[PDB]
Amino acid sequence: DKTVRWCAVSEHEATKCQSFRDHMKSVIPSDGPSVACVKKASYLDCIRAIAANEADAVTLDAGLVYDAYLAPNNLKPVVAEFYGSKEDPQTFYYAVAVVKKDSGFQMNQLRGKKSCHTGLGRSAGWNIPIGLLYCDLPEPRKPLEKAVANFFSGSCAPCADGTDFPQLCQLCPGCGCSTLNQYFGYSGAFKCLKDGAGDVAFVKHSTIFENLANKADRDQYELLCLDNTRKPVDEYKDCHLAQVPSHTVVARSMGGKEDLIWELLNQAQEHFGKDKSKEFQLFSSPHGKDLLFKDSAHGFLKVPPRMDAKMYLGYEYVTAIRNLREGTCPEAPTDECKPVKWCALSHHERLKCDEWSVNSVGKIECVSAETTEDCIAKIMNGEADAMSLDGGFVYIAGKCGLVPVLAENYNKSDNCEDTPEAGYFAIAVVKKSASDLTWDNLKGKKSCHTAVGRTAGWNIPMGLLYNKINHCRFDEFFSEGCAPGSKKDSSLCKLCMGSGLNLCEPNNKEGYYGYTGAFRCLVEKGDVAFVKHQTVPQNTGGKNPDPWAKNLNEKDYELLCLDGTRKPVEEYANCHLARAPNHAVVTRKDKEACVHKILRQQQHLFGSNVTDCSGNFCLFRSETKDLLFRDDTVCLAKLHDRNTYEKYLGEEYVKAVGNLRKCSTSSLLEACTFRRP
Ligand SMILES: [Ti+4]
């Protein structure tokens, strides 16, 4: 009925929901977002209600968001509350482990150390840390309080049972569950570390900032990272035990009215949001506290539609809560790397992966997903481990927290596994004839692109020029040009040749298609052409027999540079738009070492050493084309220092694809950006 049935868990919430209803009726048009109220006994009954189509939306803490996700409910986050500004929303907080500088231990070696918890049963203080360390605990892990007591050599766990397990109160005897215990809560847990009682304090990111105003004092503290490294306390976003959403509205995954819910809550915060009206305070509780929404909430934000619970909570939070609830660890905790789960994007990719798996003798396993973004999501949540990606998807995967580990090398050499190729150089070519041309005044000139959606011919150049575009109409920057794959009637199709049906088409039929074609576009009808550094040489000195390219001199053309200067073709290395990276294998950081190791083995067994791809299995050969890896892949090379998407792609490339993604939307990128801007 275009009506949103909100579920309340108390009589107080029901009343507020009724006020919310009546008021929203007075300000919203006859045909607009309406609200009905449904009262149930608890949050769980509300989750079941929504799943049963008896309600539509409820706001939940992280733990209950996970509950709502499980079957048969299958709810998902749709709207989130934020507690800061539009620039600093603070939708999430980060559970971190604070420690003294140079204490001499990491996450993987916390046994025998002393711990300070905010309180037993709390998220950052207990559930999350203990969830992650669950398998590192001694058996029997049940009851849990006992297992933790044995793991640490003394600690402070407020509200714990000191009578049966006194070791948990060693740092705060009695385990006082009130502020009377100086080591209770966030302030207390931090003080437990500060006074030297404990070695580590499991708290929020903001905790140390609340208990120490001088940065000089904070410098003696640092955080434990899950990759068993330490970092400064203000780098918690890169070093945290988990990332937690504070308050999130959930609805059905299918037919949950997520758009309608957003419409409702959006107009709601508009009229009755924070300090918006005196008639009704959406984020104020007249009777109770934190009714329907947290009272500290400043407003709402739409959760990107690609998001699901697993992705929203993060692999850390899910790992922890699963460990506590399921309580399953490998009975044979062998230090050998588990099979690498490769992700296949197609039927043929899967068939090749299946052959690879059999030959690997269990070292490789296979998982299928519908699209590239689905595979990335699977690597994020753990349903898969590794996959090969091009530059654009390495960028998206990087924004999603994954890291590159191995690059595909395409050049034949004696030792390619130790010489990662940075790829060719994308450059902008213009004739020496027009001396007025410069990277700045390209606006209104004639351009030649290999094709739309191309690294050197389009994405890099048009991405860097985006600041000059100021919008998403890229055919309006250049007066005319040839960019195969455009709308045909576009200005970027005006200079194209080809035939009627093959006009402005991305294929051989178009004569101005490709690097050579864009060069043809340049020499015949055009001012600038975007290609790679080997294009001009290969098409000059008589090296190209075609008539138009029959007799051209390399010295007749020059490269545009970013700062505005010009140089000859020979100096492409110092004058270029950006470097076009090779494909690279990406994975989750915790799986980097294993993926890096096992692939090397597989590479040596089935790489470019085999001759009979018939009698053996060739990893870099495809029954069709470029399955899992590019067929012209010589070998996979270790990346050394370039083990992040920023370091691997380069500043100009990430700048280009980043700007360009503002116009071309990616559902996955939206989601990952939401969790980490
Ligand atoms: Ti290319």
Coordinates of C-alpha atoms in Angstrom, one line a residue, residues 28-533:
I28 CA 3.5 14.0 3.8
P29 CA 1.2 14.3 0.7
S30 CA -1.8 12.0 0.4
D31 CA 0.3 9.8 -1.9
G32 CA 3.7 9.4 -0.1
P33 CA 5.5 7.2 2.4
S34 CA 3.1 6.1 5.1
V35 CA 3.8 4.3 8.4
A36 CA 2.0 1.6 10.4
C37 CA 3.1 0.2 13.7
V38 CA 3.5 -3.4 14.8
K39 CA 4.3 -4.4 18.4
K40 CA 6.1 -7.6 19.2
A41 CA 7.8 -8.9 22.4
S42 CA 11.5 -8.8 21.4
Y43 CA 14.0 -8.0 18.6
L44 CA 13.9 -11.7 17.5
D45 CA 10.1 -11.7 17.2
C46 CA 10.5 -8.6 15.1
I47 CA 13.0 -10.3 12.8
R48 CA 10.7 -13.3 12.4
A49 CA 7.8 -10.9 11.8
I50 CA 9.6 -9.1 9.0
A51 CA 10.6 -12.4 7.5
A52 CA 6.9 -13.6 7.6
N53 CA 5.8 -10.5 5.8
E54 CA 4.1 -9.2 8.9
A55 CA 6.4 -6.2 9.1
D56 CA 8.9 -4.3 7.0
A57 CA 11.7 -2.6 9.0
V58 CA 13.6 -2.6 12.3
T59 CA 16.8 -1.1 13.6
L60 CA 19.4 -3.4 15.2
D61 CA 22.8 -3.7 16.8
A62 CA 25.6 -5.6 15.0
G63 CA 24.9 -8.9 16.7
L64 CA 21.2 -8.8 15.8
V65 CA 22.0 -7.9 12.2
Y66 CA 23.9 -11.2 12.0
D67 CA 20.9 -13.0 13.6
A68 CA 18.6 -11.4 11.0
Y69 CA 20.8 -12.6 8.2
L70 CA 20.7 -16.3 9.0
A71 CA 17.9 -18.6 7.7
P72 CA 15.0 -18.6 7.4
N73 CA 14.8 -14.8 8.0
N74 CA 17.4 -13.7 5.4
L75 CA 17.2 -10.0 6.2
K76 CA 19.7 -7.4 4.9
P77 CA 20.9 -3.9 5.9
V78 CA 19.1 -1.1 4.0
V79 CA 19.5 2.1 6.0
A80 CA 22.2 3.1 8.5
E81 CA 22.4 5.8 11.3
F82 CA 25.3 8.2 11.4
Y83 CA 26.6 10.1 14.4
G84 CA 28.9 12.7 12.9
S85 CA 28.8 15.0 9.9
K86 CA 28.1 14.4 6.2
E87 CA 31.9 14.3 5.8
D88 CA 32.6 12.3 8.9
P89 CA 29.5 10.0 9.3
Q90 CA 31.0 7.6 11.9
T91 CA 28.5 5.0 10.8
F92 CA 30.9 2.4 12.2
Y93 CA 33.2 2.1 15.1
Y94 CA 36.3 -0.1 15.3
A95 CA 37.2 -2.7 17.9
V96 CA 40.9 -2.3 18.6
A97 CA 43.6 -3.8 20.8
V98 CA 45.7 -1.1 22.4
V99 CA 49.1 -2.0 23.8
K100 CA 52.3 -0.3 25.1
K101 CA 54.9 0.6 22.6
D102 CA 57.6 -2.0 22.0
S103 CA 55.9 -4.6 24.3
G104 CA 57.3 -7.4 22.2
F105 CA 54.2 -9.4 21.1
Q106 CA 51.6 -9.6 18.4
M107 CA 48.0 -10.9 18.0
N108 CA 49.1 -14.5 17.3
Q109 CA 51.1 -14.6 20.5
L110 CA 48.9 -13.3 23.3
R111 CA 49.0 -16.4 25.3
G112 CA 50.4 -15.9 28.8
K113 CA 49.9 -12.1 28.5
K114 CA 47.6 -10.0 30.7
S115 CA 44.3 -8.6 29.3
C116 CA 42.0 -5.7 30.1
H117 CA 38.4 -6.0 29.0
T118 CA 35.7 -3.3 29.1
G119 CA 33.3 -6.0 30.3
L120 CA 32.2 -9.6 29.8
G121 CA 29.5 -9.8 27.2
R122 CA 30.4 -6.5 25.5
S123 CA 31.4 -6.4 21.8
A124 CA 34.7 -4.7 21.5
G125 CA 35.7 -5.6 25.1
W126 CA 35.0 -9.3 25.0
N127 CA 32.8 -10.9 22.2
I128 CA 35.1 -9.8 19.4
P129 CA 38.6 -10.3 20.8
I130 CA 37.6 -13.7 22.3
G131 CA 35.8 -14.6 19.1
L132 CA 39.0 -14.1 17.0
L133 CA 41.2 -15.9 19.5
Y134 CA 38.8 -18.7 20.0
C135 CA 40.8 -21.4 18.3
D136 CA 44.0 -20.3 20.0
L137 CA 42.3 -21.2 23.3
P138 CA 43.0 -24.5 25.1
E139 CA 40.4 -27.2 25.2
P140 CA 37.8 -27.6 26.6
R141 CA 36.7 -24.2 25.2
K142 CA 33.4 -24.6 27.1
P143 CA 32.6 -23.0 29.5
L144 CA 34.3 -20.0 27.7
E145 CA 35.2 -18.0 30.8
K146 CA 37.4 -20.9 32.0
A147 CA 39.2 -21.3 28.7
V148 CA 40.0 -17.6 28.6
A149 CA 41.2 -17.7 32.2
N150 CA 43.7 -20.4 31.1
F151 CA 44.7 -18.6 27.9
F152 CA 45.8 -15.4 29.7
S153 CA 48.0 -15.4 32.8
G154 CA 45.7 -13.2 34.8
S155 CA 43.4 -10.4 33.5
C156 CA 40.5 -8.1 34.3
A157 CA 37.1 -9.2 32.9
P158 CA 34.4 -7.1 34.7
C159 CA 31.1 -8.9 35.4
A160 CA 32.8 -12.3 35.1
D161 CA 32.4 -15.0 37.6
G162 CA 35.5 -14.6 39.9
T163 CA 34.2 -17.3 42.3
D164 CA 34.7 -20.2 39.9
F165 CA 37.3 -18.5 37.7
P166 CA 39.4 -16.1 39.9
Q167 CA 42.2 -15.7 37.3
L168 CA 39.9 -13.4 35.3
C169 CA 39.8 -10.9 38.2
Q170 CA 43.5 -10.9 39.0
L171 CA 43.9 -7.3 37.7
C172 CA 40.6 -6.2 39.2
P173 CA 39.6 -8.5 42.1
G174 CA 35.9 -9.3 42.5
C175 CA 35.4 -8.3 38.8
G176 CA 33.2 -5.4 39.8
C177 CA 30.5 -4.8 37.2
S178 CA 30.3 -1.1 38.1
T179 CA 32.3 2.1 37.9
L180 CA 33.4 1.4 41.5
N181 CA 35.8 -0.9 39.7
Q182 CA 38.5 1.5 38.4
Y183 CA 39.2 -0.9 35.6
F184 CA 35.6 -1.2 34.4
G185 CA 34.4 0.0 31.0
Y186 CA 36.3 1.7 28.3
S187 CA 37.9 4.3 30.6
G188 CA 38.7 1.5 33.0
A189 CA 40.0 -1.0 30.5
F190 CA 42.4 1.7 29.1
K191 CA 43.5 2.6 32.7
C192 CA 44.1 -1.1 33.3
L193 CA 46.7 -0.9 30.5
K194 CA 48.0 2.5 31.4
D195 CA 48.7 1.6 35.1
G196 CA 50.7 -1.4 33.8
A197 CA 48.3 -3.9 35.3
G198 CA 47.6 -5.5 31.9
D199 CA 49.6 -5.9 28.7
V200 CA 46.7 -5.3 26.3
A201 CA 43.4 -3.4 26.4
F202 CA 40.5 -4.5 24.1
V203 CA 38.5 -1.3 23.5
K204 CA 37.1 1.0 20.9
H205 CA 39.2 3.1 18.5
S206 CA 38.1 6.4 20.2
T207 CA 38.9 5.2 23.7
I208 CA 42.5 6.2 23.9
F209 CA 41.6 9.6 22.4
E210 CA 39.1 10.1 25.2
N211 CA 41.5 9.2 28.0
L212 CA 44.5 11.1 26.7
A213 CA 44.4 14.6 25.2
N214 CA 48.1 15.0 24.5
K215 CA 49.3 13.3 21.3
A216 CA 52.8 13.1 23.0
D217 CA 51.3 10.7 25.6
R218 CA 49.5 8.6 23.0
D219 CA 52.8 8.0 21.1
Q220 CA 53.7 5.4 23.8
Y221 CA 50.7 3.3 22.7
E222 CA 50.0 1.4 19.5
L223 CA 47.5 -1.1 18.1
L224 CA 47.7 -4.8 17.3
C225 CA 46.9 -5.6 13.7
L226 CA 45.4 -9.0 12.6
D227 CA 48.3 -9.5 10.2
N228 CA 50.5 -9.7 13.3
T229 CA 51.9 -6.2 13.0
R230 CA 51.6 -3.0 15.0
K231 CA 50.6 0.5 14.0
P232 CA 50.0 3.9 15.6
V233 CA 46.7 4.4 17.4
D234 CA 45.3 7.0 15.0
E235 CA 45.8 4.4 12.2
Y236 CA 43.0 2.2 13.6
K237 CA 41.2 2.2 10.3
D238 CA 44.2 0.2 8.9
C239 CA 44.8 -1.7 12.2
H240 CA 41.7 -3.0 14.0
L241 CA 40.2 -6.3 15.3
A242 CA 36.9 -5.5 13.7
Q243 CA 34.6 -3.0 12.1
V244 CA 31.2 -2.7 13.6
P245 CA 28.0 -0.8 12.5
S246 CA 26.4 1.0 15.4
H247 CA 22.8 1.0 14.4
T248 CA 21.3 -0.3 11.1
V249 CA 17.8 -0.7 9.7
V250 CA 17.2 -4.1 8.1
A251 CA 14.4 -5.4 5.8
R252 CA 13.7 -8.5 3.7
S253 CA 16.2 -9.4 1.1
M254 CA 13.5 -9.9 -1.5
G255 CA 10.5 -7.6 -1.5
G256 CA 11.6 -5.7 1.6
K257 CA 10.6 -2.3 0.3
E258 CA 14.1 -1.0 0.8
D259 CA 13.6 2.0 -1.4
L260 CA 10.3 2.8 0.2
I261 CA 11.9 2.5 3.7
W262 CA 14.6 4.9 2.6
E263 CA 12.1 7.3 1.1
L264 CA 10.2 7.3 4.4
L265 CA 13.2 7.7 6.7
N266 CA 14.7 10.3 4.4
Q267 CA 11.7 12.6 4.4
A268 CA 11.4 11.8 8.1
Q269 CA 14.8 13.2 8.9
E270 CA 14.1 16.1 6.6
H271 CA 11.1 17.3 8.6
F272 CA 11.6 15.8 12.0
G273 CA 15.4 15.1 12.0
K274 CA 17.9 16.5 14.5
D275 CA 16.9 20.1 15.5
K276 CA 14.5 20.1 12.4
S277 CA 11.2 20.5 14.3
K278 CA 9.9 21.2 17.8
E279 CA 6.7 19.3 17.2
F280 CA 8.5 15.9 16.9
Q281 CA 12.0 14.7 17.6
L282 CA 12.7 11.6 15.6
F283 CA 15.9 10.9 17.6
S284 CA 14.6 11.8 21.0
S285 CA 12.8 9.5 23.4
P286 CA 10.1 11.2 25.5
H287 CA 9.6 8.2 27.8
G288 CA 12.3 5.6 27.3
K289 CA 15.8 6.0 25.8
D290 CA 17.0 5.0 22.4
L291 CA 13.5 4.3 21.2
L292 CA 13.4 3.0 17.5
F293 CA 16.6 4.9 16.9
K294 CA 19.6 5.8 19.1
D295 CA 19.2 9.2 20.7
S296 CA 22.7 10.1 19.7
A297 CA 21.9 9.6 16.0
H298 CA 22.3 12.7 13.7
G299 CA 20.6 11.2 10.6
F300 CA 20.2 8.4 8.1
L301 CA 22.2 7.0 5.1
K302 CA 21.1 4.7 2.4
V303 CA 23.0 1.4 2.4
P304 CA 24.2 0.6 -1.2
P305 CA 21.8 -2.1 -2.6
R306 CA 24.7 -4.5 -3.3
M307 CA 25.4 -4.9 0.4
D308 CA 24.5 -8.0 2.4
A309 CA 25.0 -8.7 6.1
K310 CA 28.3 -10.6 5.6
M311 CA 29.8 -7.8 3.5
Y312 CA 28.4 -5.1 5.9
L313 CA 29.7 -6.6 9.1
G314 CA 33.1 -7.6 7.6
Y315 CA 34.9 -10.9 7.5
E316 CA 36.4 -10.1 11.0
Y317 CA 33.1 -9.6 12.8
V318 CA 31.6 -12.6 11.1
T319 CA 34.6 -14.8 12.0
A320 CA 34.4 -13.8 15.7
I321 CA 30.6 -14.3 16.1
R322 CA 30.7 -17.6 14.2
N323 CA 33.5 -18.9 16.5
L324 CA 31.6 -18.1 19.6
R325 CA 28.3 -19.5 18.4
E326 CA 29.4 -22.5 16.3
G327 CA 32.6 -23.2 18.1
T328 CA 34.4 -25.2 15.5
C329 CA 38.1 -25.3 15.0
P330 CA 40.2 -27.7 12.9
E331 CA 40.8 -30.8 14.9
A332 CA 44.0 -31.3 13.0
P333 CA 45.5 -27.8 13.1
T334 CA 48.3 -28.5 10.7
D335 CA 50.4 -25.5 9.7
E336 CA 50.1 -26.5 6.0
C337 CA 48.3 -24.0 3.7
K338 CA 44.7 -25.0 3.0
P339 CA 43.7 -25.5 -0.6
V340 CA 43.6 -22.2 -2.5
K341 CA 40.0 -21.6 -3.7
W342 CA 40.2 -20.0 -7.2
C343 CA 37.1 -18.2 -8.4
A344 CA 35.7 -19.0 -11.9
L345 CA 33.6 -16.4 -13.8
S346 CA 32.2 -18.8 -16.5
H347 CA 31.5 -22.3 -17.5
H348 CA 34.7 -22.7 -19.5
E349 CA 36.8 -21.0 -16.7
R350 CA 35.3 -23.5 -14.3
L351 CA 36.2 -26.5 -16.6
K352 CA 39.8 -25.3 -16.8
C353 CA 39.9 -24.8 -13.1
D354 CA 38.6 -28.3 -12.5
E355 CA 41.3 -29.7 -14.6
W356 CA 43.9 -27.6 -12.8
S357 CA 42.4 -28.8 -9.4
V358 CA 42.8 -32.5 -10.3
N359 CA 46.4 -32.0 -11.5
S360 CA 47.3 -30.0 -8.4
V361 CA 46.5 -32.9 -6.2
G362 CA 44.1 -31.0 -3.9
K363 CA 46.4 -27.9 -3.7
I364 CA 43.8 -26.0 -5.8
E365 CA 40.0 -25.9 -5.4
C366 CA 37.4 -24.1 -7.5
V367 CA 34.4 -21.9 -6.8
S368 CA 31.9 -20.5 -9.3
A369 CA 30.2 -17.1 -9.3
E370 CA 28.1 -15.2 -11.8
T371 CA 30.3 -12.1 -12.4
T372 CA 33.7 -10.6 -11.6
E373 CA 32.2 -8.5 -8.7
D374 CA 30.6 -11.6 -7.2
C375 CA 34.0 -13.3 -7.1
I376 CA 35.6 -10.3 -5.5
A377 CA 32.8 -10.4 -2.9
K378 CA 33.5 -14.1 -2.3
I379 CA 37.2 -13.4 -1.8
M380 CA 36.2 -10.7 0.7
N381 CA 33.9 -12.9 2.8
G382 CA 36.1 -16.1 2.6
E383 CA 33.9 -18.1 0.2
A384 CA 36.9 -18.0 -2.2
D385 CA 40.6 -17.1 -1.9
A386 CA 42.3 -16.0 -5.1
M387 CA 41.6 -14.7 -8.6
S388 CA 43.2 -12.8 -11.5
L389 CA 42.1 -9.3 -12.4
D390 CA 42.8 -6.4 -14.8
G391 CA 43.7 -2.9 -13.7
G392 CA 40.2 -1.6 -13.2
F393 CA 39.1 -4.5 -11.0
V394 CA 42.4 -4.4 -9.1
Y395 CA 41.3 -0.9 -8.2
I396 CA 37.8 -2.0 -7.1
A397 CA 39.2 -5.0 -5.3
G398 CA 41.7 -2.7 -3.5
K399 CA 39.0 -0.3 -2.4
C400 CA 37.3 -3.5 -1.1
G401 CA 40.3 -4.4 1.1
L402 CA 41.9 -7.0 -1.1
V403 CA 45.6 -6.9 -2.1
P404 CA 47.6 -7.8 -5.2
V405 CA 50.1 -10.6 -4.6
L406 CA 51.3 -11.8 -8.0
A407 CA 51.4 -10.0 -11.4
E408 CA 51.1 -11.7 -14.8
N409 CA 54.4 -11.3 -16.7
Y410 CA 54.1 -11.2 -20.5
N411 CA 57.8 -10.8 -21.5
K412 CA 59.9 -13.9 -22.1
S413 CA 63.1 -13.8 -19.9
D414 CA 65.5 -15.9 -17.9
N415 CA 64.0 -15.0 -14.6
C416 CA 60.5 -13.5 -14.8
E417 CA 59.3 -14.6 -11.4
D418 CA 61.5 -11.9 -9.8
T419 CA 61.0 -9.0 -12.2
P420 CA 57.4 -7.7 -12.0
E421 CA 56.5 -5.8 -15.1
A422 CA 54.9 -2.3 -14.6
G423 CA 53.4 -2.6 -18.0
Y424 CA 53.6 -0.2 -21.0
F425 CA 53.2 3.6 -20.9
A426 CA 50.0 5.3 -22.0
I427 CA 50.8 8.5 -23.9
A428 CA 49.2 11.3 -25.9
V429 CA 50.6 11.9 -29.4
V430 CA 50.3 15.1 -31.4
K431 CA 52.0 16.3 -34.6
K432 CA 55.0 18.6 -34.3
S433 CA 53.2 20.8 -36.8
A434 CA 50.8 22.4 -34.3
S435 CA 53.0 24.0 -31.7
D436 CA 50.0 25.5 -29.8
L437 CA 48.9 22.1 -28.5
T438 CA 49.4 21.4 -24.8
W439 CA 47.7 19.1 -22.3
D440 CA 45.7 22.1 -21.0
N441 CA 44.2 23.4 -24.2
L442 CA 42.9 20.1 -25.6
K443 CA 39.4 21.3 -25.1
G444 CA 37.7 21.9 -28.4
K445 CA 40.3 20.0 -30.5
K446 CA 40.1 16.8 -32.5
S447 CA 40.8 13.6 -30.7
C448 CA 41.5 10.0 -31.7
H449 CA 40.7 7.1 -29.3
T450 CA 41.4 3.4 -29.8
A451 CA 37.9 2.7 -28.5
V452 CA 35.6 3.6 -25.5
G453 CA 36.4 1.6 -22.4
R454 CA 40.1 1.3 -23.1
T455 CA 43.1 1.8 -20.8
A456 CA 45.4 4.0 -22.9
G457 CA 42.9 5.1 -25.5
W458 CA 40.1 6.3 -23.2
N459 CA 40.2 5.5 -19.5
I460 CA 43.6 7.0 -18.6
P461 CA 43.4 10.1 -20.8
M462 CA 39.6 10.8 -20.3
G463 CA 40.1 10.0 -16.6
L464 CA 42.8 12.5 -16.0
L465 CA 41.0 15.2 -18.0
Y466 CA 37.9 14.7 -15.9
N467 CA 38.7 17.8 -13.8
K468 CA 38.3 19.7 -17.1
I469 CA 35.1 17.9 -17.9
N470 CA 33.4 18.8 -14.6
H471 CA 30.5 16.4 -15.6
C472 CA 30.0 13.1 -17.4
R473 CA 29.5 14.2 -21.1
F474 CA 32.9 13.3 -22.5
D475 CA 32.0 14.0 -26.2
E476 CA 31.6 17.7 -25.3
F477 CA 35.2 18.2 -24.3
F478 CA 36.7 17.4 -27.7
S479 CA 34.9 19.2 -30.7
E480 CA 35.2 16.0 -32.8
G481 CA 37.0 12.7 -32.9
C482 CA 36.7 8.9 -33.5
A483 CA 35.9 6.8 -30.4
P484 CA 34.7 3.4 -31.6
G485 CA 31.8 2.2 -29.4
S486 CA 30.0 5.5 -29.0
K487 CA 26.3 6.2 -29.8
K488 CA 27.1 6.4 -33.5
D489 CA 25.3 9.8 -33.9
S490 CA 27.8 11.2 -31.4
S491 CA 30.5 13.8 -32.1
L492 CA 33.0 11.1 -31.2
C493 CA 31.7 9.2 -34.2
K494 CA 32.1 12.1 -36.7
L495 CA 35.6 11.3 -37.8
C496 CA 35.2 7.6 -37.9
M497 CA 35.2 5.9 -41.3
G498 CA 34.5 2.2 -41.6
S499 CA 31.2 1.3 -43.3
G500 CA 27.5 2.1 -42.6
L501 CA 26.9 -0.7 -40.1
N502 CA 30.5 -0.8 -39.2
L503 CA 30.7 3.0 -38.5
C504 CA 32.2 4.0 -35.2
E505 CA 32.2 0.3 -34.3
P506 CA 34.8 -1.4 -32.0
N507 CA 36.3 -3.9 -34.4
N508 CA 38.6 -4.4 -37.5
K509 CA 35.9 -3.0 -39.8
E510 CA 36.5 0.5 -38.4
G511 CA 39.8 1.8 -39.9
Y512 CA 40.3 4.1 -37.0
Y513 CA 39.9 1.3 -34.4
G514 CA 42.9 0.3 -32.2
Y515 CA 46.3 1.9 -31.6
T516 CA 47.2 1.9 -35.3
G517 CA 43.7 3.0 -36.2
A518 CA 43.8 5.9 -33.7
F519 CA 47.2 6.8 -35.3
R520 CA 45.5 6.7 -38.7
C521 CA 42.9 8.9 -37.3
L522 CA 45.6 11.3 -36.1
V523 CA 47.5 11.6 -39.4
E524 CA 44.4 11.8 -41.6
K525 CA 41.8 13.7 -39.6
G526 CA 42.7 14.8 -36.1
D527 CA 44.9 16.8 -33.7
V528 CA 45.6 14.3 -30.9
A529 CA 45.7 10.5 -30.5
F530 CA 45.8 8.4 -27.3
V531 CA 47.9 5.3 -27.6
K532 CA 51.0 3.4 -26.1
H533 CA 54.7 4.3 -26.4

